Amino acid sequence: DTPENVLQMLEAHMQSYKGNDPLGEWERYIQWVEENFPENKEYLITLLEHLMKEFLDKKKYHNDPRFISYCLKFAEYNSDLHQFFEFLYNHGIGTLSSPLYIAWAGHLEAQGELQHASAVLQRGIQNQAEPREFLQQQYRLFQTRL
């Protein structure tokens, strides 16, 4: 029952939260199970899933580096990375974030899908994802393989 318990703990704490930065509260709790449950990722996964559902419609967090970081974290527990990344992208989550382009095309490259990887990296550049130079650098590294 425990996983659902820490979720209920959090979910309640959040109702008493009269404040400006919901995301920051979730971080406190998410970090907490992180430093206290290397055992069962069952806790992280639950929290992570509800992070998404909670923030799916909170457009103002969609390029927040910490939200995007949990998105990348959660990707690790996903069965279908193609679907997952594409989902993130076409809901505008991380569309201005270099890491999301680098992680996503990085998986594509690893899969030997070089042409897909190329488009993902170039899109990120077209869209002006930041840090700009970091994305431009990885895209150059990618190119040496052609």
């Binding site: 996964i45 998404m52 996903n78 069965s79 279908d80 997952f84």
Partner: peptide, 12 residues
């Protein structure tokens, strides 16, 4: 791992 299809579906 979790099933991303099921997971994303719940999200709509």
């Amino acid at each position: 791992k979790i099933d991303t299809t099921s997971f994303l579906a719940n999200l709509k």
